[PDB]
Design a protein around this ligand. Structure first.
Ligand code: OGA
Ligand code: MG
Ligand code: NI
Ligand code: ZN
Length: 331
């Protein structure tokens, strides 16, 4: 069995290996990368996503989200308070202001300590989930706006044509902006490219150990757990590495820098935070190995999780028994 300790693997594909996306994901899996839940891919030196980032300031962040925390430093929830629209140039200036800028620090580890110690006492503003792409149309390799669609994968595997589309999302972050513990919708893969700016630190639980995280979360968030049998689908709960270690939950951590891809694998719980102003792009995707995870994915039906149009068909075809209840939660 490859990668039996479930370590995060880092890959350095050549330009020739960077041509065929599906083949390279399958190669990574042949080496056990999926066992960690997360892998890093450093593009060949010849590759670029686009020529420059000098002309992105006029992108609009229609609904910036202020991430307000409740709880204790290592065990907290966050809610998103909607703010007035601002451009990327306005957001960058705000991120660099004295109120919001990254503090002085020695190294990534010192910054991580400061994050966990101090996050709850501040409310950073995240430009998340913005439909669009920063890949040049002429970039042919690993262009997240040109991937094979999940609807086409389900059709290829299972023979059923379904409605829906699959497009990327941009994330503009600042110091302390936070992504809560979650798996992807329908336990899909995700791929994330950090276009520019400061790093993003990730934490991940191996898929084979995901239920350990869920059980801890039910213990630590007992009101939430009574409200919903899949409340991590709400994407609001944070648990620190120190707390995970005290409770014996297997996990790993890694920092992504500008120019690097991360892939999350089916049912790989992940969480993390941004170091300072940055821009990432991400999209969900599927492979043949995903289908069995999609069939078994938990679902939120309490009404909180509210998701895209395209998840309808995945539930309807892969989870017909659950469909009626799940759709009530959507309506
Ligand atoms: O970058 C973020 O805020 C969150 N990203 C992801 O959860 C991902 O790419 O799967
Ligand atoms: Mg612009
Ligand atoms: Ni994710
Ligand atoms: Zn719910």
């Amino acid at each position: 069995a490859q990668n039996p300790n479930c370590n995060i693997m880092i890959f350095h594909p050549t330009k020739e290996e960077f041509n065929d996306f599906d083949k390279y994901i399958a190669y990574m899996e042949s080496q056990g990368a999926h066992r960690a839940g997360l892998a890093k891919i450093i593009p060949p030196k010849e590759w670029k996503a686009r020529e420059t980032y000098d002309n992105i300031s006029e992108i609009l962040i229609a609904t910036p989200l202020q991430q307000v925390a409740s709880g204790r430093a290592g065990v907290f929830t966050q809610y998103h308070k909607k703010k007035k629209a601002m451009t990327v140039g306005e957001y960058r200036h705000l991120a660099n202001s004295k109120k919001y800028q990254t503090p002085p620090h020695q190294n990534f580890e010192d910054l991580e300590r400061k994050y966990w110690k101090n996050r709850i006492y501040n409310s950073p503003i995240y430009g998340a989930d913005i439909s669009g792409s920063l890949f040049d149309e002429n970039t042919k390799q690993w262009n997240l706006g040109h991937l094979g669609t999940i609807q086409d994968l389900l059709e290829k595997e299972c023979g059923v044509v379904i409605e829906g589309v699959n497009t990327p999302y941009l994330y503009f972050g600042m110091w302390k902006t936070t992504f809560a513990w979650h798996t992807e919708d329908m336990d899909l893969y995700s791929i994330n490219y950090l276009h520019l700016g400061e790093p993003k630190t990730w934490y991940v639980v191996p898929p084979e150990h995901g239920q350990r995280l869920e059980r801890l979360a039910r213990e630590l968030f007992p009101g939430s757990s009574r409200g919903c049998g899949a409340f991590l689908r709400h994407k609001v709960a944070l648990i620190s590495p120190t707390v995970l270690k005290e409770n014996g939950i297997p996990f790993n951590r890694i920092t992504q820098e500008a120019g690097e891809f991360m892939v999350t694998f089916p049912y790989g719980y992940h969480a993390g935070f941004n170091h300072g102003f940055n821009c990432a792009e991400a999209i969900n995707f599927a492979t043949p190995r995903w289908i069995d995870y999609g069939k078994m994915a938990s679902q939120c039906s309490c009404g909180e999780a509210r998701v895209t149009f395209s998840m309808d068909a995945f539930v309807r075809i892969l989870q017909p028994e659950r469909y009626d209840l799940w759709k009530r939660g959507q309506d």
